[PDB]
Write a structure and sequence with these properties.
Pfam families (chain A): MCR_alpha, MCR_alpha_N
Strand content of chain A: under 5%
Number of domains of chain A: 3
Number of helices of chain A: 24
Strand order of the largest sheet of chain A: 4-5-3-6
Distance between the termini of chain A: 53 Å
Keywords (chain A): Cytoplasm, Metal-binding, Methanogenesis, Methylation, Nickel, Transferase
Radius of gyration of chain B: 20 Å
Bound molecules: factor 430, Coenzyme B, 1-thioethanesulfonic acid, magnesium ion, zinc ion
Largest interface: B-D, 55 and 65 residues
Number of helices of chain B: 8
Helix content of chain A: 40-55%
CATH superfamily of the largest domain in chain A: Methyl-coenzyme M reductase, alpha/beta subunit, C-terminal
CATH superfamily of chain B: Methyl-coenzyme M reductase, gamma subunit
Radius of gyration of chain A: 25 Å
Distance between the termini of chain B: 30 Å
Oligomer: part of a larger assembly
InterPro entries (chain A): Me_CoM_Rdtase_asu (IPR016212), Me_CoM_Rdtase_asu/bsu_C (IPR008924), Me_CoM_Rdtase_asu_C (IPR009047), Me_CoM_Rdtase_asu_N (IPR003183), Me_CoM_Rdtase_asu_N_sub1 (IPR015811), Me_CoM_Rdtase_asu_N_sub2 (IPR015823), Me_CoM_Rdtase_Fd-like_fold (IPR009024)
CATH class of the largest domain in chain A: Mainly Alpha
Chains: A mainly alpha (548), B alpha+beta (246), C alpha+beta (442)
Protein name (chain A): Methyl-coenzyme M reductase I subunit alpha
Pathway (chain A): One-carbon metabolism; methyl-coenzyme M reduction; methane from methyl-coenzyme M: step 1/1
Shape of chain A: globular
């Protein structure tokens, strides 16, 4: 069948994708683009209303001396200009991050122990349901004990709620099913049995605070807001004194002893509290993405859905705004989720490994890394050489480096069933690419790349970590675009090839298996395309409280 | 010195750019004035601006390292550090980004070289930069169709050539003339119009590009068939991997 | 000596050990036993070899509920504890037969490790203890079993957790009484970020030894913070001696007098009487049926009032055998004594303010928890400069089982290793013996 | 001795000082001069008495552009410096004949303070230096002028800034080479958070001495981090000796041979020839007109390549007298040497990778700055384990005035005070003397 990027390349350019020559300078600059024309008109309108110049297409250099391309969102049939994939212009991308930032997982294990042992009251499915009715009134910001409380408007905070899950089916089925993430409904049988075995008789809350609060405030608000309203609801539902010594054990349990943040806090140069993107380890990002429970027949699809999740969050929002800003890093990330390019390379490598070894049947060693990563690197690079339209599409070397090395590292991990050798294959890919074309990425692209080989298997204090546990705060990774979302894909790759239900935390995997989320984590690239088309409906808006 | 493994023309060309004993082929003559104009840092007859006073005016303490290391002439004078930056087409330009930084640090003294996919730069003291720049412009480091002198707006290394065989340039600093076949530099490297254009000679024909290129490609010499060069890359990978462990 | 004061030193049974020892013999800057306790707490690490082995066999590494399917390694680390420990000790030590200690406990399930003090005299801080310990155990595990390059990173994760993606050693199977330098509320706070339950576990819930260890650590931090420099130094030393060291047997004797039937208020009445008997306070003015007391020695009044405050905690929380009310004792001993006398309460109101927030954050939804999880670096309990936390330590030592987050719950690894060390366990014995030994050199 | 290696040690003029010194005599764990340097940098504070006086007179306290109208206090601090310094010293010292130093400079406008070592042996970390110094000078200034209770908090703000509202001493008029413990990227990093410009200023831009001080601090941090424990120890000691201590005169002799007309590439050719001549590498395999080199001692190959890298920086940035190209030298020295030889570059690629990001963050819009503002704790330059930042120090020592953020701009207070201290200013001298002294104890 044609390579998977050919339809996109025929949509973008009039020439055939193999054609080496074109014409430039004849498209009228920005005037060729619907979106730039919208921007030029909006800038005139903004500047005139506010009395300060703003967007002006004649500032600096004239965009569109070449074709300003559409991009196909991979796995979709939606083609949009890249400005529609900028996170500022894409409400689905903003809501994806809000839905992670505003979530926290909070055990009821220590809490129920405090109730039984310290207050001397019984817990059963019935008392749990009554506590859940109470906390779903209180969590969005409404009162249960005091007189003369003033409360949040329920429609502004409609996205905030609490659900629970447990690995004990008979206990799950006794709690009111309005509040339950049903593992058996959400996961195919084998993954459901794995997840339930991990959870056991433990009972956990998934708490989502309001998007309007998360946007007002920060990620470190989430576990606090969660615990306040858990605390009020434990007072009201189990009939405590409203503020006695035992109250503080529910606070410590919900805020510290049985909380699981999405992200850990950051060191001072990049100071941030919990539940910010830099704290989210790669294994958690693969677990947040829900492609694993829907597309499990196709480990390439699962892995590259995780790459899309991560390239957007880690390069566009985190590195391209929290850690920099401006125009930012849209196409550094779009290279990994558009035009079916990474998909073409990664299916090639998956089939190569199937034919030579069998998925997960290769020895977990450097021989396998050298064989698979080299073969897949050369395939990817040959496509840019055979198709000048493909090279002009992924015009920055960093974009190519990330795409070729993601396909090489995911394919190596499909062979070995182990993410560490996948990561060695990523670095070998960069070294071969650099020598093949006498270039790689931007000035600073390969800081982690050159430290890379030596730190894959190191065991030293700030060097040695399995890839699943690394994240944007692993020292070598803390700065640069074109790596973090691809590493989350490599962390997913061996687990999707093995059919594992999760990559690093089963509670995080379950916690996003929930259609009450605003963003649909089962189809990240589909949602990105919906947002690009201005068809996604986010939470958090102030329309109800502002002039009509 | 050996410089680079491999048995292709690409490999030998990578070694020749690094080797200061290899005489770079001169392809074109450019006047001193025109190198100055293309750099764009100062006007013809303008004295070299200074960033600090001449070394002899500074009366420094005894330092055995400084006493052993001879300063380049622009450092003795206190010249500004300025730059020259080139973009090389992936369609078989003779030099390429890492080839340039590796070569510059073997050939040139007092050099700050930077490599990127779409641009490669050297920064050094201004009067010394003008002497190196003549060599980068006059020799087979440069082709006037497939290489561009560009301080900003560098896009084009990865683009399709136009119908004349010229790399894309958002700011059209180098113009091929359809009737004559020569390229002229019509703007300096930052994109400002030159009073008079600089002739940069004829684009190298396809055969000569293939003789002189340092990029590996499936339609030229493929890197994967230069098995000795791949062996050394793989060796480096494996030795760094084992050494980081134990 | 800079100061003229002398104190009489007693043992933990209330028996005299040494008379008329100069106050500065108890100073953290002079007493060699306080130096060896602080250096020991810098350098001591608890290694949970059974936890490492279990994390490896299950691939449960990197923090709560985390697991990597397919990464399990089944290594017989506890069965080979002696060899692993010896190989780690050879990397930990600087020279053979220096002060490095590596001792197995619980049939090889745990190791007490004391990294050589010389590594700290060439270090900025104290992180060499967990870092040098973790790497020596990671390498000795890998070398014991010939763990491959491909798998060794799981040994690392099972030892030290998610570091460096997380700032802390999240999920580590090693433990220290100190916590990482980034978590200090201010420079100089490291000896304050020691959980009260750790102090009570290491002293085996001996009430006077838990109070002494906590006061040592708190008042030693007040030197490192600069608070006990210059004008304030004597106030801090007299607090150490009278509230933490049982100087003059004053905490002991107030507890003896009030333990059978006493309250916080009966202890206040006894301490005001004893301060007037000893000339620490005097009647300054008579109002209508009320005497206004004054003092010519605010540091000494503070110290007597601090001894009373400790005795009142031991009476009130000892009577309940329930630690929670320590927050109330710390508040109302100070509030009551100010309206009883007209003189300022302990730490000039800062114990009372610490107690207001501590009471709130141990009885509310907003944060905190039970007494045992506080420490001098906790935002709720940092505000008094050493005079509050040791009372919390005494109250948790007296708690007979009312807490969920007890020292048995939070501090079991710490207990098994740190209580081995005689000077951490019974620091009142060793600090008093060292003060008597140096008495004529101060 | 754990290691059999011996090295010859030279002074900064290339003359032999001592032959055949055991490697561990240079270890931070054994060498007494490295101990005195590290305890010195923990305990030494620069006090800007003029800056305190000016901040008070204008009420400009609390950080850039901040001022409190109506709070101005005009105190003759510099004219009474001798008295103020003596009173601060009495509070700083532990005893009258200890190693506290308080010395006025600049006619009383500045003071060098060295807080007594013993305060640190009973401290967790190093913040007692600024905190004990700050309060002793705040108290001494208050007591010199009898500043009232209502005004004294302005003296505190002028000395220590906006702390504790800010985490740092924001607006302080004291300075140290270390920075606060909360700013460490990881535990064990404090000796790495020392600006390159502070090292170059303390050593008066003597290139070899700047490279030595930087190396001593970086490799001593490697011990505190646990990196130099076990398998890696010899690699770190040999890097210290050859890259920072000019062992065997290797750096010196490379620079001598390449200084007149040399490049990074000529220094590589000479180092490869010297490694071959010394037996550190040998030809393993012949490819087509290409010799593949091997080694049976990767730590020694790494060290020789590290000495070459320092020489290449001296040649390259010495010829330009401009530091910026150190990021390029650190990159392409390592990239060229691997394709020249078939062996891994310094620190197995981690100098090269540090240099890629350092080059980017010294020539782009995103962060970083000029070479002198980096340090081993900086996110851009932390990745190599001691083998990159000393080259940056050498390059800034050789810079003739191309930097806006030069040591004169960022480190003038540091320079005046810390270059007074002989062991900080000329550490190559003292560490080599101490190594020769303990030669027979290893
Ligand atoms: C000024 C810099 C230096 C710097 O610190 N950042 C710049 C510019 C910055 C700006 C450019 C916005 C603008 O035009 O005003 C932004 C968008 C960051 C921001 N401030 O919002 C950016 N780069 Ni850059 N930058 C990019 C890239 C690149 C590629 C472009 C090569 C080419 O041939 O076109 C090269 C590096 C390389 O050669 O590998 C590059 C250089 C550069 N990058 C050169 C300018 C190059 C030029 O003069 O043309 N970027 C890329 O390779 C692709 C992604 C792209 C980013 C925007 C997006 O992700 O959508 C953008 C990311
Ligand atoms: C004490 C501390 O909580 P922890 O004991 O760390 O759980 C802290 N909260 C607070 O200070 C709550 C302040 C606002 C609520 C009470 C206002 S009176 C915090 O979350 O960091
Ligand atoms: C280096 C550091 O900047 P400073 O040197 O501290 O100014 C850091 N920025 C970054 O890492 C930029 C990362 C994203 C922009 C570059 C992506 S390649 C930060 O702001 O904390
Ligand atoms: O040109 S740079 O590599 O510095 C920045 C790329 S976005
Ligand atoms: Mg083949
Ligand atoms: Mg839906
Ligand atoms: Mg000429
Ligand atoms: Mg008696
Ligand atoms: Mg031969
Ligand atoms: Zn926000």
């Amino acid at each position: 069948a044609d390579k998977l990027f050919i339809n996109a390349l025929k949509k973008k350019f009039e020439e055939s994708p193999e054609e080496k020559k074109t014409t430039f300078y004849t498209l009228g600059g920005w005037k060729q683009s619907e979106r730039k024309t919208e921007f030029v008109n909006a800038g005139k309108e903004v500047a005139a209303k506010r009395g300060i110049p703003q967007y002006n297409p004649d500032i600096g250099t004239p965009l569109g001396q070449r074709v300003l391309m559409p991009y196909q969102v991979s796995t979709t049939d939606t083609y949009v200009e890249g400005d529609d994939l900028h996170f500022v212009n894409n409400a689905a991308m903003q809501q994806m991050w809000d839905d992670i930032r505003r979530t926290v997982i909070v055990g009821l294990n220590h809490a129920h122990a405090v109730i039984e042992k310290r207050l001397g009251k019984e817990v059963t499915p019935e008392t749990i349901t009554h506590y859940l009715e109470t906390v779903n009134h209180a969590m969005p910001g409404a009162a249960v004990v005091q007189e003369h409380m003033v409360e949040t408007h329920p429609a502004l905070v409609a996205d905030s709620y609490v659900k629970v899950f447990t690995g004990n089916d008979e206990i799950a089925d006794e709690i009111d099913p309005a509040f339950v993430i049903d593992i058996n409904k959400q996961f195919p049988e084998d993954q459901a049995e794995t997840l339930k075995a991990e959870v056991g008789d433990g009972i956990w809350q998934v708490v989502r605070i309001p998007t309007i609060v998360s946007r007002t405030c920060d990620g470190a608000t989430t576990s606090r807001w969660s615990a306040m309203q858990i605390g009020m609801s434990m007072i009201s539902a189990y009939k405590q004194a409203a503020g006695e010594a035992a109250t503080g054990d529910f606070a410590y349990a919900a805020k510290h002893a049985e909380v699981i943040h999405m992200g850990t806090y950051l060191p001072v140069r990049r100071a941030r509290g919990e539940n910010e993107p830099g704290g989210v380890p790669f294994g958690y990002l693969a677990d947040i993405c829900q492609s694993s429970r829907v597309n499990y027949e196709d480990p390439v699809r699962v892995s590259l859905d995780v790459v899309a999740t991560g390239a957007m969050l880690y390069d566009q929002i985190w590195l391209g705004s929290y850690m920099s800003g401006g125009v930012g890093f849209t196409q550094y990330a779009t290279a990994a989720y558009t035009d079916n390019i990474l998909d073409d390379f990664t299916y090639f490598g998956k089939e190569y490994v199937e034919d030579k070894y069998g998925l997960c049947e290769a020895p977990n060693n450097m021989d396998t890394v050298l064989d698979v990563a080299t073969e897949v690197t050369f395939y990817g690079l040959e496509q840019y050489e055979e198709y000048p339209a493909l090279l002009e599409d992924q015009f920055g070397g960093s974009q190519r480096a990330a795409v070729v090395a993601a396909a090489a590292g995911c394919s190596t991990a499909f062979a070995t069933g182990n993410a560490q050798t996948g990561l060695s294959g990523w670095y070998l890919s960069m070294y071969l690419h650099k020598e093949q074309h006498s270039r790689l990425g931007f000035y600073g692209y390969d800081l982690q790349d050159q430290c890379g080989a030596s730190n894959v298997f190191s065991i030293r204090g700030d060097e040695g970590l399995p890839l699943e546990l690394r994240g944007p705060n692993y020292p070598n990774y803390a700065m640069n675009v074109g790596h973090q979302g691809e590493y989350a894909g490599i962390s997913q790759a061996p687990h999707a090839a093995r059919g594992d239900a999760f990559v690093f935390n089963p509670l995080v995997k379950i916690a996003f298996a929930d259609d009450n989320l605003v963003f649909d984590f089962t189809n990240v690239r589909g949602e990105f395309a919906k947002g690009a088309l201005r068809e996604f409906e986010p939470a958090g808006e102030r329309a109800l409280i502002t002039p009509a | 010195a050996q410089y680079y493994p491999g048995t292709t023309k690409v490999a030998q060309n990578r070694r020749n750019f690094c080797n200061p004993e290899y005489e770079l082929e001169k392809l074109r003559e450019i006047s001193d004035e025109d190198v100055v104009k293309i750099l764009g840092h100062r006007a013809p007859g303008e004295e070299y601006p200074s960033v600090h006073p001449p070394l002899e005016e500074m009366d420094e303490p005894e330092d055995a390292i400084r006493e052993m290391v001879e300063p380049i002439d622009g450092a003795k004078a206190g010249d500004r550090v300025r730059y020259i930056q080139f973009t090389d087409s992936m369609y078989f330009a003779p030099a390429q980004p890492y080839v340039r930084s590796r070569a510059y640090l073997c050939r040139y003294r007092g050099a700050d070289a930077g490599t990127l996919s779409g641009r490669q730069i050297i920064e050094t003291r201004e009067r010394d930069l003008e002497k190196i720049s003549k060599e980068l412009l006059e020799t087979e480091f440069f082709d006037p169709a497939r290489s561009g002198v560009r301080g900003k707006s560098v896009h084009g290394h990865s683009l399709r050539l136009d119908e004349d065989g010229m790399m894309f340039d958002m700011l059209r600093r180098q113009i091929y003339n359809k009737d004559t076949g020569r390229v002229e530099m019509v703007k300096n490297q930052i994109g400002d119009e030159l009073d008079e254009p600089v002739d940069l000679g004829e684009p190298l024909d396809e055969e000569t590009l293939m003789e002189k290129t340092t990029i590996y490609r499936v339609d030229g010499e493929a890197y994967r068939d230069d098995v000795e060069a791949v062996e050394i890359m793989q060796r480096i990978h494996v030795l760094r991997s084992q050494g980081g462990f134990n | 000596a800079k100061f003229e004061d002398k104190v009489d030193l007693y043992d933990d049974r209330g028996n005299l050990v040494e008379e008329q020892v100069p106050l500065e013999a108890l100073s953290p800057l002079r007493n060699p036993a306080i130096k060896s306790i602080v250096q020991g707490i810098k350098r001591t690490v608890a290694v949970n070899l059974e936890g490492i082995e279990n994390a490896l066999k299950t691939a449960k590494v990197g923090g709560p509920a985390c697991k990597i399917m397919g990464r399990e390694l089944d290594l017989d680390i506890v069965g080979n504890a002696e060899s692993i420990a010896a190989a780690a000790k050879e990397m930990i030590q600087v020279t053979e037969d220096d002060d490095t200690n590596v001792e197995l406990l619980g049939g090889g399930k745990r190791a007490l490790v004391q990294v050589p003090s010389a590594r700290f005299d060439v270090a900025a801080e104290y992180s060499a203890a967990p870092l040098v310990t973790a790497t020596a155990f990671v390498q000795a595990i890998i070398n014991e079993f010939d763990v491959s390059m491909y798998d060794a990173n799981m040994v690392k994760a099972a030892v030290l957790g998610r570091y460096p993606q997380s700032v802390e050693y999240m999920g580590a199977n090693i433990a220290t009484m100190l916590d990482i330098p980034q978590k200090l509320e201010g420079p100089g706070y490291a000896l304050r970020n020691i959980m009260v339950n750790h102090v009570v576990a290491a002293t085996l819930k001996n009430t006077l030894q838990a109070a002494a260890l906590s006061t040592i650590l708190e008042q030693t931090a007040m030197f490192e913070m600069g608070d006990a420099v210059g004008a304030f130094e004597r106030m801090h030393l007299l607090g150490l001696a009278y509230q933490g060291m049982n100087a003059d047997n004053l905490v002991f004797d107030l507890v003896k007098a009030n333990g059978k039937e006493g309250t916080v208020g009966s202890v206040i009445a006894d301490l005001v009487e004893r301060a007037l008997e000893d000339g620490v306070i005097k009647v300054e003015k008579e109002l209508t049926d009320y005497k206004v007391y004054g003092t010519d020695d605010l540091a000494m009044w503070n110290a007597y009032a601090a001894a009373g405050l400790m005795a009142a905690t031991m009476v009130n929380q000892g009577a309940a055998r329930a630690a929670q009310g320590v927050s109330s004792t710390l508040l109302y001993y100070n509030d009551l004594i100010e309206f009883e006398t007209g003189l300022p309460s302990v730490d000039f109101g800062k114990v009372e303010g610490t107690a207001v927030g501590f009471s709130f954050f141990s009885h509310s939804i907003y944060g905190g928890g039970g007494p045992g999880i506080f420490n001098g670096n906790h935002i709720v309990t940092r505000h008094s400069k050493g005079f509050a936390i040791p009372c919390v330590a005494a109250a948790m030592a007296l708690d007979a089982g009312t807490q969920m987050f007890s020292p048995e719950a939070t501090s079991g690894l710490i207990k098994e290793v740190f209580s081995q060390v005689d000077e951490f366990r019974e620091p009142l014995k060793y600090v008093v013996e060292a003060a008597a030994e140096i008495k004529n050199e101060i």
